[PDB]
Paper text:
Orexin A (OxA) and orexin B (OxB), also termed hypocretin-1 and hypocretin-2, respectively, are excitatory neuropeptides produced in the hypothalamus that control sleep/wake behavior by promoting and maintaining wakefulness, and suppressing rapid eye movement (REM) sleep. OxA and OxB signal through the two closely related receptors, orexin receptor type 1 and type 2 (OX1R and OX2R, respectively), expressed widely across the central nervous system. OX1R and OX2R are class A G-protein-coupled receptors (GPCRs) of the β-branch that signal predominantly through heterotrimeric Gq/11 leading to increased cytosolic Ca2+ levels. In this work, we determined single-particle cryo-electron microscopy (cryo-EM) structures of OX2R–G-protein complexes bound to OxB and the small-molecule agonist 3′-(N-(3-(2-(2-(2H-1,2,3-triazol-2-yl)benzamido)ethyl)phenyl)sulfamoyl)-4′-methoxy-N,N-dimethyl-[1,1′-biphenyl]-3-carboxamide (compound 1) to further our understanding of orexin signaling and to enable structure-based drug discovery of novel therapeutics for the treatment of NT1.
We have recently discovered diarylsulfonamide compound 1, a potent and selective OX2R agonist. We obtained improved density maps at an overall resolution of 3.0 Å for the structure with compound 1 by including a synthetic nanobody, Sb51, for additional conformational stabilization and to aid alignment of particle projections. Sb51 binds to the extracellular surface of OX2R contacting residues in extracellular loop (ECL) 2, and part of ECL3 without directly interacting with compound 1 or significantly altering the structure of the small-molecule binding site, suggesting that the compound 1–receptor interactions are likely unaffected by the presence of the nanobody. The ligand is kinked around a central sulfonamide, positioning the two flanking phenyl rings approximately perpendicular to one another. This core interacts extensively with OX2R: the sulfonamide forms a bidentate hydrogen bond interaction with Q1343.32, while the adjacent phenyl rings contact a lipophilic patch formed by P1313.29, M1914.64, T1112.61, and V1142.64. The amide-linked phenyltriazole inserts into the hydrophobic bottom of the pocket that accommodates carboxy-terminal M28 of OxB in peptide-bound OX2R. The amide carbonyl of the linker forms a hydrogen bond with H3507.39, whose sidechain also contacts the terminal 1,2,3-triazole moiety and the distal phenyl ring of the core, thereby stabilizing the kinked conformation of compound 1. However, facilitated by conserved P1092.59, the last two turns of TM2 are shifted outward in compound 1-bound OX2R, enlarging the subpocket between TM2 and TM7 to accommodate the substituted biphenyl fragment of the ligand.
Numbering used by the authors:
A (entry chain R): 55 to 251, 292 to 378
B (entry chain H): 1 to 120, 135 to 247
C (entry chain A): 11 to 60, 207 to 254, 265 to 394
D (entry chain B): 2 to 340
E (entry chain S): 2 to 112
F (entry chain C): 5 to 62
Write the structure that this text describes.
Amino acid sequence: WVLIAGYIIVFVVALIGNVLVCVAVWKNHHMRTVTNYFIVNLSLADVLVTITCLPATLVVDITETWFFGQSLCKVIPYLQTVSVSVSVLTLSCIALDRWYAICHPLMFKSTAKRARNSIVIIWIVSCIIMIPQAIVMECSTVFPGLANKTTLFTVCDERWGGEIYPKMYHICFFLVTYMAPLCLMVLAYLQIFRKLWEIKQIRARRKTARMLMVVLLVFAICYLPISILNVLKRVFGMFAHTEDRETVYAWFTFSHWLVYANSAANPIIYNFLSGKFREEFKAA
Amino acid sequence: DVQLVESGGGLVQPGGSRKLSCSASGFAFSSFGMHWVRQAPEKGLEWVAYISSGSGTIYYADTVKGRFTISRDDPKNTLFLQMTSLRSEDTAMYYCVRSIYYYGSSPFDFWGQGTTLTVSGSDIVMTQATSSVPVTPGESVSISCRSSKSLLHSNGNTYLYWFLQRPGQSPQLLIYRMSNLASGVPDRFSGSGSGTAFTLTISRLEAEDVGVYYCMQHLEYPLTFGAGTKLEL
Amino acid sequence: TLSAEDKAAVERSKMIEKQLQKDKQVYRRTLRLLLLGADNSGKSTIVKQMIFETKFQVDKVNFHMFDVGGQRDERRKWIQCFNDVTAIIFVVDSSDYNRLQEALNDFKSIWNNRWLRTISVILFLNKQDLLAEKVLAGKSKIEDYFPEFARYTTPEDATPEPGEDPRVTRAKYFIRKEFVDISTASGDGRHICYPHFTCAVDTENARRIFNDCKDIILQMNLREYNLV
Amino acid sequence: SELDQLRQEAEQLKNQIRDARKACADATLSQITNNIDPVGRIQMRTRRTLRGHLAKIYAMHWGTDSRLLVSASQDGKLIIWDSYTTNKVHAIPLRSSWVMTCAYAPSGNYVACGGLDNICSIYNLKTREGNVRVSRELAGHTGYLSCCRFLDDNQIVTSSGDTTCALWDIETGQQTTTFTGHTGDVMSLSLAPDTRLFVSGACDASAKLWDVREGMCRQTFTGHESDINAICFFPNGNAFATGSDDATCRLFDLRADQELMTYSHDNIICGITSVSFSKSGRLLLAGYDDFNCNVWDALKADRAGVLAGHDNRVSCLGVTDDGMAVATGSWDSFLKIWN
Amino acid sequence: VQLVESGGGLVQAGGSLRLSCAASGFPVGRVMYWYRQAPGKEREWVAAISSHGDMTAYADSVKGRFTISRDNAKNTVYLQMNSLKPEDTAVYYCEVYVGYFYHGQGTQVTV
Amino acid sequence: NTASIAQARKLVEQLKMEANIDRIKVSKAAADLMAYCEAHAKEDPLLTPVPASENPFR
Ligand SMILES: COc1ccc(-c2cccc(C(=O)N(C)C)c2)cc1S(=O)(=O)Nc1cccc(CCNC(=O)c2ccccc2-n2nccn2)c1
């Protein structure tokens, strides 16, 4: 099947690319720069997204049954969503730090203490914002109720009491994990594009603006379907009546594949597309 | 010229409050640690307070802990001691002492002038068993000071300090760390000893070498003095 | 197992490190500019109208420009000190033609120095009022010293000032071409050259150095961010 | 014709000097020391790293008690370190940011520095006021000064880049003796163990042996092919080692008046920045532009170790008086202790 | 969207009860579950009734002991409990799926 | 040109006073440097290193 093959391909690329960037920073001492703190934090966030989200997603999809009991039902979605939001927030911090270094190069803002404080603020804000992903997740038993299913199956889903708390929480979730990093990244890369737009250096600094808009479009496309599908399911209440509930799982598990493909394509579009990183990568 | 001058003494009713302050003219005040060291009307002298350079460390004796406080004013170049809950055991004379600490420095080198204040335990016991030795001008005199704990630290330094108080003025650092002579001392003084037993030797004693000689340990806080040894003719 | 004096010595060392960190915060945000040129260049009248050291400010940015002229003619041994400066300001008296090949040889000796392989040059072609007056006089010709000026026509992509003769513009762009031929023949991408024309009573020089240092640090940031 | 006659006489005297040098050459230092058993691969590891400077470190000097050391950097500071505990004992701000040399007094009381301001500034460490105050500024050189070395508390020998050395008396301020005779910038000097004659290396590939008391150049040593920018005496004061930009060190000899041995390897093409000996006189340590130091056997010309670990060019190097450490400071603002 | 429970109380061992769950605010063609939570223990599944009330589903512990039904007129689901055990004192909730698992206040049964 | 004459004559005087130094053999000088370097081998904490009980940079 195409989905099992796709997950198997995007597992190993994400794993080996991010651990190669990590050990290449760890071995070579000339790569321990202030600009590489966010990139090694992004690489740990992408191996966490790769090992906590992907096998659980494929196993829960192709079996349609949660196995792991209520303690892991409260533990695993916490780590999954914490890893995803850490990855998105460090992408937006990379965009802001590139905005400080190009559109305002003479206010020497990029220091190592700033990168350290930004990293710990990212981890703290994500770990505090994902707390009802550990409070609410209960293991439940879904009865389909149509002639052909005839078999129960355990899910690990949210269980709220009262209808306004999940709506305001998932509106806050959609604003934190998609809309605010997208707005900051669009503002930063749009002003960088206005800045970088004598023949040879213009032809060389136009390519940089092109690949930065490529990076922005990769993030803006790979995270859009799962965000609008999650805010359509939890807030507005769609995909609830069991018309055909194995097409919904197929589209929801395709929309997770785009997230994992972005976490696999991060070390390609952030490290391995510049010649300087290749020249410093083969020295370790 | 280096000088410290303290004021704020006088007669205070018991139980009240009083403030002392030493103004410092002639040295880089912001880089010297400062001490308040007092002396009873007829007894030897004892250490009451210490503030650091940059005020990052403050130490007190057990007698004044909680009812005294010490604070420095680095732009205005002053050191304050605010004393509340005065007993009749705080009648004394107060000296403001500078001391700087780095590798090879000379702490306790310059001493203030002293305010006369009148009011209406796992330590290091420094023992000077003598009280008065009769001297003749042109003779070598040896003064002992026996510690209780060993003052020889593991880094080789033996923290023992010898001071001289002439009749009518403030003490003066003769030797520091059991061997080293301070700047401005005549070379006839010599410090000997080991571990717990120490000796100050004065060769060809003159008439301006009289007074009481104090030994002081700087291995651990609080800094304990000796009882002194008077030298009369 | 430290003593009392050892702990106070460590506290002294910590306060010294605090003052050194404040000095690093001041030192990181300043821009050092090595100013040089020949003896007739008007190099000092640039910095007196805007002495080893000189400090000035443009838009709350601190510039620290230093002219090293207390030594003799052998610059080959102290120029290793200035291999991490922001820019080199090279001043050229562009009106005496017989001392122009010496300036071109000196610029070729600085541009191809092994310690200045990453340092960009802001080039001020000083004293252009005398050049305009000597060209409009017509008594001293440039093809007696540079014969390729007999074959040079001014390009249509130039930016002539209002009031310029074509002869003054041809002379100015020939001199600028003679320097950018040396600057564009080596070190592509590592460092650039920024040629400006300057009068003696010109007042836009601090803004020009400011804009060129902005572009220099922008390119340095594009390089060090794996982003070029 | 008298100019040509004296030029012919000068080249004839240079020919008879070379004849007298080649007459006394009976063997080679690599020929007498064939039978000596070698040293072995030396593994000197980094004990301390001293991280306080903001810009490139240009010079250091050990104290005579083998514990304290002063170091000068291009951000305009001297820092005096307690190297056993890595404590910063002093931090002295300089008037000019471009400092190229550094010196610690053999009594410990004073420190000297100098640079592109042509001035040797002398600082009094043990004042009655607790701060490090500038004692005095010696200003009589017309070029930048390259090296300072104290003789006493009251006199100091200064190399400068106006092709001249000098002997200053600090209680007065006026230079007592001027040692002229070089033709390029004098880059370094090294005093004898008895400090009655010193040696200097300049940018004309020549090293001269000056007598401090009288003032004449005693001998001249011409073996190199580029700028000698490091010099250091053998510990008995009868030989010295020079390092230049032609990737060679060599050991000249005061009594035999000629070169003994060259220390060079074909995989080394960068210049030497610093040269020192060990306490016995067998490990010639040399700092290079390829970011590391080399330990040459001073009797076999063999290499015996590498001290790598500096990210940038090693600019200063020194061995203590008890021989128990080697401090190297480099252009990445770091000093490192090795034994 | 509102779910109200009724019918609980303290009834001795071996009787019968009739819990009612009235539902309003969502379309009436939805599967309705009955869950319970014992004080101290976790949340277990009791019963489930389908969209139109034709197919039921029970767990193993209450199989043949409880019975569920659905009235489409007042939009209510009933759980008639027969043959109570003393280990069944628990709070009963009536849950449904709207994006998540929405439940009601629940009523205490004590035996 | 007289300054060139004075410079050249003081140069030839310097070469004359440098030519008249007594030179010892190079083999005896190498033997002396070797003898000093072998008679001080036990006092070198870099050549023959000391144990960590004596090393102050431990
Ligand atoms: C990642 O984990 C899974 C992925 C898919 C499935 C799956 C697939 C198809 C159908 C079914 C299904 O309903 N049945 C009956 C079989 C289940 C299961 C698991 S899971 O069971 O391991 N974890 C878990 C369970 C319930 C909620 C949460 C919150 C997970 N959060 C998000 O979705 C999410 C929303 C917006 C932006 C990013 C987001 N995001 N992507 C990555 C991590 N967070 C986590």
